[PDB]
Nucleic acid binder design. Structure first.
Ligand code: MG
Ligand code: MG
Ligand code: MG
Ligand code: MG
Ligand code: MG
Ligand code: MG
Ligand code: MG
Ligand code: MG
Ligand code: MG
Ligand code: MG
Ligand code: MG
Ligand code: MG
Ligand code: MG
Ligand code: MG
Ligand code: MG
Ligand code: MG
Ligand code: MG
Ligand code: MG
Ligand code: MG
Ligand code: MG
Ligand code: MG
Ligand code: MG
Ligand code: MG
Ligand code: MG
Ligand code: MG
Ligand code: MG
Ligand code: MG
Ligand code: MG
Ligand code: MG
Ligand code: MG
Ligand code: MG
Ligand code: MG
Ligand code: MG
Ligand code: MG
Ligand code: MG
Ligand code: MG
Ligand code: MG
Ligand code: MG
Ligand code: MG
Ligand code: MG
Ligand code: MG
Ligand code: MG
Ligand code: MG
Ligand code: MG
Lengths: 134, 158, 262
RNA sequence: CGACUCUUAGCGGUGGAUCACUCGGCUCGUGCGUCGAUGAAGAACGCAGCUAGCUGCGAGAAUUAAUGUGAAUUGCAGGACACAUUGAUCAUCGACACUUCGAACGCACUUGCGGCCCCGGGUUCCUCCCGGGGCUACGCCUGUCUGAGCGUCGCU
RNA sequence: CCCCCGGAGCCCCGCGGACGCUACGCCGCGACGAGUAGGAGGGCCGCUGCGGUGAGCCUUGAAGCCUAGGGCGCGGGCCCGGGUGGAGCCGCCGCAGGUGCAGAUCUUGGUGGUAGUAGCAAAUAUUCAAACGAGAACUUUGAAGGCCGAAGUGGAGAAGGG
RNA sequence: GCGAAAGACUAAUCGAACCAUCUAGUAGCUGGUUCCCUCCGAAGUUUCCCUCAGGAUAGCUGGCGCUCUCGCACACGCAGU
RNA sequence: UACCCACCCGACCCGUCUUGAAACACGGACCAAGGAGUCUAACACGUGCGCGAGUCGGGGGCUCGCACGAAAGCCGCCGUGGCGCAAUGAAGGUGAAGGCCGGCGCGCUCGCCGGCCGAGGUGGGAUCCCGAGGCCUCUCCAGUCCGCCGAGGGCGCACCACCGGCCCGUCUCGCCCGCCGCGCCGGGGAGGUGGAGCACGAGCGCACGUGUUAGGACCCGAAAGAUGGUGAACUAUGCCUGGG
RNA sequence: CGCGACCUCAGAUCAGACGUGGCGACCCGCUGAAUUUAAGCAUAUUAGUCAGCGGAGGAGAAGAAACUAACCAGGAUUCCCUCAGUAACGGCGAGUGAACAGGGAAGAGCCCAGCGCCGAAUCCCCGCCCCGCGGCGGGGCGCGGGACAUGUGGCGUACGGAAGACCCGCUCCCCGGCGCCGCUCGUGGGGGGCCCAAGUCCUUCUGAUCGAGGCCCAGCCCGUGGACGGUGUGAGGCCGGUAGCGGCCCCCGGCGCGCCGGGCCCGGGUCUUCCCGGAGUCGGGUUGCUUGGGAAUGCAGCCCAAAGCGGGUGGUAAACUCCAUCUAAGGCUAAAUACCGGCACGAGACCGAUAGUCAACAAGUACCGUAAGGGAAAGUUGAAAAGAACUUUGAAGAGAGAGUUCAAGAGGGCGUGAAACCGUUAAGAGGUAAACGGGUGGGGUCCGCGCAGUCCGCCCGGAGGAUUCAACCCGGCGGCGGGUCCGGCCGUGUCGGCGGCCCGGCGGAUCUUUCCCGCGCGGGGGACCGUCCCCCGACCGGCGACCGGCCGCCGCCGGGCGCAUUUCCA
């Protein structure tokens, strides 16, 4: 159960706080898990997806083991746009198809100044909770 | 149009009850709004009788009611010069001063004086400063208590 | 709302105009102009007797009524007949007024709790709850009341010393203090007899809570258990005592198909 | 079997019920209790690369600086940038800004008329004239200056 | 003697009891059952909401919908046969309703018959040829016949219109 | 208000406008009033009414009941007789 | 059983107001959807449950960020009060108790003093108890057990009818008084009558049905009335300024 | 024929302030109906309500008695319960219709004027410095202004106060800074940011799963987290989240020590001297509204208009007369208390797009009226536009193929897709309009079958064929029933223990202050009765409350029994 009044739990109110959330927040929402290799290496469960991050489809029509790189992110349609993830239209003009973060797994994070410090700070929070539970 | 045995009934709904109806779905949230005052006030005035100041034994008025007794408003004035308490001091010492009571009898005077005499004796005057002089009750009679009196100070039972 | 369909300014052009004598909306080059307003019968408009706020929503019971409602719920929390007959999956349970050590008030982790509910063979009620999880039939779905499930065993404890934390995530379990029992939760649906788990600490406190019988409650002001209307509740024993059987006219059970007249 | 018609059925529409959803209501609670001549509430007009509407904003006009945030933004373009960078975007907002009416304030509401101060050009105060900035609405309080009175006196 | 039913062998059986005994179940008798208004009772008659409960049902297809698909109740309705539909649904025990339509020149939206019906009648007026065009009585150009007929169907303005 | 005067006209409105609210105005008066089955089952009669289109009370009806009898070889009562 | 068709008999179109409707009365083209006895307060009776000369409920308190919670639990609260536990009188106020016995006062159907019993009786009164007598039982008698029948007799609730009684009001009448005090003081009798009275209790709380009102009030359904505002763009007048 | 004070009064675009509109639920003044009700009706009521109007704030008003009372008295306001739907009012009728006491929420008290005391002890505005400056303030210094003697400061205000005499005891608050130390309840104050478990494991459905079995305890993991939403179907585990004195970083809040600058000689108790109340006010007469106030409750206009052991009040006029109780004419104030407007949230037995607000969307929008004002309709493709490329017919609208799609019988007003209604295909009918009731008959579409429906079930006899038994004992296990209540444990009624009684409590206005503690009372202890526990002994219901042995019977398992038995099959 939730408890804290000063949080919602309302079929509608957080259905709403979806396709009205600003791009600020949608980052956090549009997060996908990391593959076991990284999840081991780094002590972080899931990350916000980013433009040039390498990704494996896990669910969907065209699930597979092919590591495609992300191309862009509709944070508006609120859905990502990957590499050989694509379909041929009537004219031959290939169009990519939408997939969530949530239905995808990160196989190689594209690292940075700003993204490293998150990976540190998430892994530091994880271990602080386990050291606090200890 | 009445039919065969009832009362008359002058129910008074010819005006406009409808507009000015108060329903009470505050009642329980109010209960709690209140709780938090009782609560907060006590934690704020930490060592001090939570209920409020000391208040006098007093007789109910009209003829039926005679035999009862109450917490009155405040102890009289005549009452204090007798107990040896200055009226403006009393107000700081958690002693409730009405200054508006005609004291008519020695019975209910001394009865009510004994409450002050009683109060003095079981009162720990917590001293102005920590390094303070006279009349404040000693660091033993000081350590022993942090005790708020829950419920009405020296409750008046008939 | 008090204003429901009642914000219109419609006169009613009554009689001489065919129409219908409703109050019909004024002027306009809209469509909503000569429609009808303030009829229960009409669009916009409003209902019978606007559901008002000062309906007597809540209700009332005598203390005594609702103390010996708890009695009757508790008394039938024994008697495996009634408890089972709520689908309370008590078959491998050792005994029915199921008392447990007072170590239990002090578990602080759901894994401990769960290991208790195995070792008292009481999974299979929670198990059962745990299968009965579905989407509610109706319109409640789109109102914060989508899922539903069974009730699981009630668990009772004189003092939260960490316990209520432990038995929380486990679906179906409700905790109740002994000092603060509740008829809604012991006897859900107004049916009798839920599976309960007294912890010794609590189980002692039941007679002191609300009485033995030739002794006061000594925790409620004045309260003693209800007397029975009759003691020997089984009558089948009664009906074949020799006292009774001796003093009875002999039967009449030829039966007696009616006679066709010739 | 001729055509029409009726009934029923087999299918085609028309209509938009029913059902199923639901970023909206409604009701009930809790917290706080938010205006203005430094110029409100209210209106007008304008503002996007492609924009009519809603919405957001105000000639710094689909915002301003800053701090988090931290890579998008996107209907299509176009872009900087160096994504080792206040560094895209969003939220916050605290830094600066506030077209025209309006209690609307120079006087009126035509959108015209002025007055009085300054600074450009003109002049070289020569006055306009052309340019620029500040004032100028009513009431009333404390104070100041200038007064009036065969009011009450004083000294002449 | 005149003996034991764990055995008389049983139409009587009292030693233990239906299949039948939802103890508001079932069974036999008799008797009786015109109805407006109204009452009353009975409704595993019907709608929507919740507490219980049904190891209910459900992407192996729900609600609705559709059915000259088998049935059941006296009947409210109910149950079964198929197709389509595409997401949720029901049974019992309770509780809760804004609760069941043929009517109110009832409300809203839609649709017929009428009906391919009334009708496209005020100012005498058109015709030819060519162009353009997929397509021309209806546009345009030419030619011809006509009208308004300077108190105009002529040429300019106001208010209004924008 | 306005009327050489006709109750003329006051923006399709005049024996006196239109707009919103009081506003669910009131109505002894029109109309309607939504699922089955079972049982019993009227009155249009009485007196008072500012009563005659309505009420008041008399009736008749249902429901709810109760006190008993005894059809359990072993009844008193009642009655459009 | 349903669809079409066929036949034979039957047969007026519903709703409604209505002494009487197929009406040469009114509503009603057809279909979908919406649609009219609701809530609250107050009574009243009926019923369900708790407790019972009590019983409650709030409003308050004590125990929550509620997830469930705006719940549940608990409180010399618990009774500060309502309702009931007693009425009657306009009001001052009075207030439900009688029987019997003995004794004393002349028992004067008047006054007082000691004891006994305590809600008086009659008739009906479900009815519980007693029961004379049957009525068997393989024989004659004897006899305990066991039931059935049972004339006749006793207690008799509830209720009904009656007769008695006591409180208050009022009347009548008539007696004796106590005496912190004086009787325009207080007090005591008898008979009658008025009382929504007592005469060994039934309420309280909470359900639900019905009903009756107050409530918009079953829905729909006026001509009006009031309060505030907008209009001379039409027309009526006046005026100002233009044109024919 | 001047100059000068003051008083009154002007003018200043003077120096500095400020007022005005809106919002308007709640809040305060006033004003103010009529529908309506009374079966009419005007009295009454609606109802001091709506409109009108005026006015405020985070709440508003009121408030420290000219009160209550009749007690053995209480003691500002407001609020809730209660009084109590009561006292009374009324063509005493419809209606109306309060209060006093008690309980409870909260609860705080105070200030003026005058009498006087005190070199105006005061106040305002300038100039120079010292600190302070995103609510303009302290500190100092200035013959820099000015009000104020028609009166500014302190004490003081009625509950007494002043002033004196001697009775007693003894000295810390305030404010401007300027630092610093303890982040100071949801369970680290407010706000923001940032952060913290566990499967996309097997297999299998499916277009896609989030579904179904399984997976080291309902499977694996997590579970202070299994709310919810997202995620091409129902997902604790994928993701956001959730839980969780979980973490960290800013900011903001508030409170604690130091330093400093300033301010302040502020007590307590006794005996005397005197000193006191707010005028065109109270009151009365009158009229007008109001309530319930009355032979006057409230408020008004006018008229008359006071006193000082007075005045008001002490609720049917009045005189006399006795008693109580306040003290007006000046003023402030938290708290509970109210909140259909605002911001910000949380929820629901709610409605679910002709409902729900007019408004799920370009909603107060389109449109109408000159204007006040009036004021709508309208949600849904799919999961993804993957939204028909291309050939072809067609001037073009439209088609046919094709293509996409799980599905286009989801095609841009697209989920579903009813009826009226209309579209055509098939069957059958058809002069008394159709339509209906009863009864059959023919035909169809379908539905049961039968390529015999001979329906099954016992038992038995016969003939074939096949396993191990049944009957019996013996070993074991498990029931059942019986009793000896045998032995023990259990509880009902009785008796005994007076044994718990103080090692058994709680109730009782029972009793003792012979007791103890604290101030006759309160608390505590000690005696008493009613209640509830131990010991053991006796009787009895010996009770579903067992548990042990003995028994009797049954069942299962394992042994024995090989076949005239006991099964299976045809
Ligand atoms: Mg208090
Ligand atoms: Mg509506
Ligand atoms: Mg449904
Ligand atoms: Mg529609
Ligand atoms: Mg619809
Ligand atoms: Mg002069
Ligand atoms: Mg019948
Ligand atoms: Mg409803
Ligand atoms: Mg309907
Ligand atoms: Mg002509
Ligand atoms: Mg022209
Ligand atoms: Mg005429
Ligand atoms: Mg009629
Ligand atoms: Mg006729
Ligand atoms: Mg008619
Ligand atoms: Mg009462
Ligand atoms: Mg009138
Ligand atoms: Mg204002
Ligand atoms: Mg009438
Ligand atoms: Mg009337
Ligand atoms: Mg009238
Ligand atoms: Mg009147
Ligand atoms: Mg009035
Ligand atoms: Mg009134
Ligand atoms: Mg108003
Ligand atoms: Mg008071
Ligand atoms: Mg989930
Ligand atoms: Mg989901
Ligand atoms: Mg997670
Ligand atoms: Mg006065
Ligand atoms: Mg009045
Ligand atoms: Mg005052
Ligand atoms: Mg004030
Ligand atoms: Mg105030
Ligand atoms: Mg719609
Ligand atoms: Mg709508
Ligand atoms: Mg649709
Ligand atoms: Mg639809
Ligand atoms: Mg489909
Ligand atoms: Mg579809
Ligand atoms: Mg869908
Ligand atoms: Mg469709
Ligand atoms: Mg057809
Ligand atoms: Mg044909």
């Amino acid at each position: 159960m939730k408890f804290n009044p000063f949080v919602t739990s309302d079929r509608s109110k957080n259905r709403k706080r979806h396709f009205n959330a600003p791009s600020h927040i949608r980052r956090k929402i549009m997060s996908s898990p990391l593959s076991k290799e990284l999840r081991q290496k780094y002590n972080v469960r899931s990350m916000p997806i980013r433009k040039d991050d390498e990704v494996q489809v896990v669910r969907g029509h065209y699930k597979g083991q092919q590591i495609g790189k992300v191309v862009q992110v509709y944070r508006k349609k609120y859905v990502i746009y990957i590499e050989r993830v694509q379909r041929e239209k009537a004219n031959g003009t290939t169009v990519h198809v939408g997939i969530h973060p949530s239905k995808v797994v990160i196989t190689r994070l594209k690292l940075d100044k700003d993204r490293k410090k998150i990976l540190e700070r998430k892994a530091k929070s994880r271990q602080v909770g386990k050291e606090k539970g200890k | 149009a009445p039919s065969r045995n009832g009362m008359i009934l002058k129910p008074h709904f010819h005006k406009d009850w409808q507009r000015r109806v108060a329903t009470w779905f505050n009642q329980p949230a109010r209960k709690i709004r209140r709780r938090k005052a009782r609560q907060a006030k006590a934690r704020r005035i930490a060592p001090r009788p939570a209920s409020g100041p000391l208040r006098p034994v007093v007789r109910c008025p009209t003829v039926r009611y005679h035999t009862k007794v109450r917490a009155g408003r405040g102890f009289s004035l005549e009452e204090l010069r007798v107990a040896g308490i200055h009226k403006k001091v009393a107000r700081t010492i958690g002693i409730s001063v009405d200054p508006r009571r005609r004291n008519k009898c020695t019975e209910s005077l001394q009865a009510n004086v004994q409450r002050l005499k009683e109060y003095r004796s079981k009162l720990i005057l917590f001293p102005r400063k920590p390094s303070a002089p006279k009349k404040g009750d000693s660091s033993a009679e000081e350590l022993k208590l942090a005790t708020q009196l829950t419920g009405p100070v020296m409750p008046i039972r008939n | 709302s008090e204003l429901a369909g009642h914000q219109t300014s419609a006169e009613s052009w009554g009689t001489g105009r065919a129409v219908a004598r409703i109050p019909r909306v004024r002027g306009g080059g809209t469509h909503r102009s000569g429609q009808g307003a303030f009829g229960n019968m009409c669009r916009g408009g409003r209902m019978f007797a606007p559901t008002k706020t000062w309906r007597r929503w809540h209700r009332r019971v005598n203390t005594t009524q609702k103390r010996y409602a708890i009695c009757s719920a508790l008394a039938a929390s024994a008697l495996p007949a009634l408890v089972m007959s709520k689908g309370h999956r008590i078959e491998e349970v050792p005994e029915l007024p199921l008392v447990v050590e007072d170590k239990v008030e002090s578990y602080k982790k759901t894994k401990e709790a769960v290991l208790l509910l195995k070792k008292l063979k009481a999974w299979n009620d929670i198990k059962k709850v745990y299968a009965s999880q579905r989407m509610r039939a109706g319109k409640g779905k789109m109102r914060n009341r989508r899922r539903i499930q069974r009730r699981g065993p009630c668990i009772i404890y004189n003092e939260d010393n960490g316990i209520i934390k432990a038995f929380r995530n486990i679906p179906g379990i409700t905790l109740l203090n002994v000092s603060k029992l509740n008829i809604l939760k012991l006897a859900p649906g107004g049916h009798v007899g839920r599976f309960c788990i007294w912890t010794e600490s609590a189980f002692r406190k039941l007679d002191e809570l609300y009485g033995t019988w030739r002794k006061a409650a000594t925790l409620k002001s004045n309260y003693n258990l209800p007397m029975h209307k009759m003691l020997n509740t089984d009558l089948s024993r009664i009906l074949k005592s020799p006292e009774i059987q001796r003093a009875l006219r002999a039967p009449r059970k030829k039966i007696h198909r009616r006679v066709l007249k010739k």
